[PDB]
């Protein structure tokens, strides 16, 4: 991530930092087939286990974005 941002800044010292590429998350994430297998047991555990339950700051925005005389 540091290298991609440094590359972008060196070539474009005028722009915000590039977002993280998705293949980064891809090797950060386990095989999605395992996730699909776990989906149903995830749901059954969630039903079987009753669980009960702030961000620091969500600023740099106010809400979301910016005839005949």
């Amino acid at each position: 991530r540091l290298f991609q941002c440094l590359l972008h800044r060196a070539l474009h010292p005028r722009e915000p930092l590039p977002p993280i590429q998705q293949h980064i998350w891809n090797m950060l994430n386990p095989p999605a087939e395992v996730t699909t297998k776990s989906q149903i047991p995830l749901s059954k555990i969630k039903t079987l286990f009753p669980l009960i339950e702030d961000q620091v700051t969500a600023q740099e925005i106010f809400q979301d974005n910016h005839k005949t005389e």
Binding site: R1, L2, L6, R9, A10, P13, L17, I20, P30, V34
Partner: peptide, 28 residues
């Protein structure tokens, strides 16, 4: 790096250190 002296703000460095929120992401 090389011929390029890359200039940033420290904060920008901090947000490029931002990947995931504090917590545990079960991977398997």
């Amino acid at each position: 790096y090389g011929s390029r002296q890359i200039i940033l703000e420290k904060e920008e460095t901090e947000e490029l250190k931002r990947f995931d929120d504090p917590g545990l992401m079960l991977m398997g």
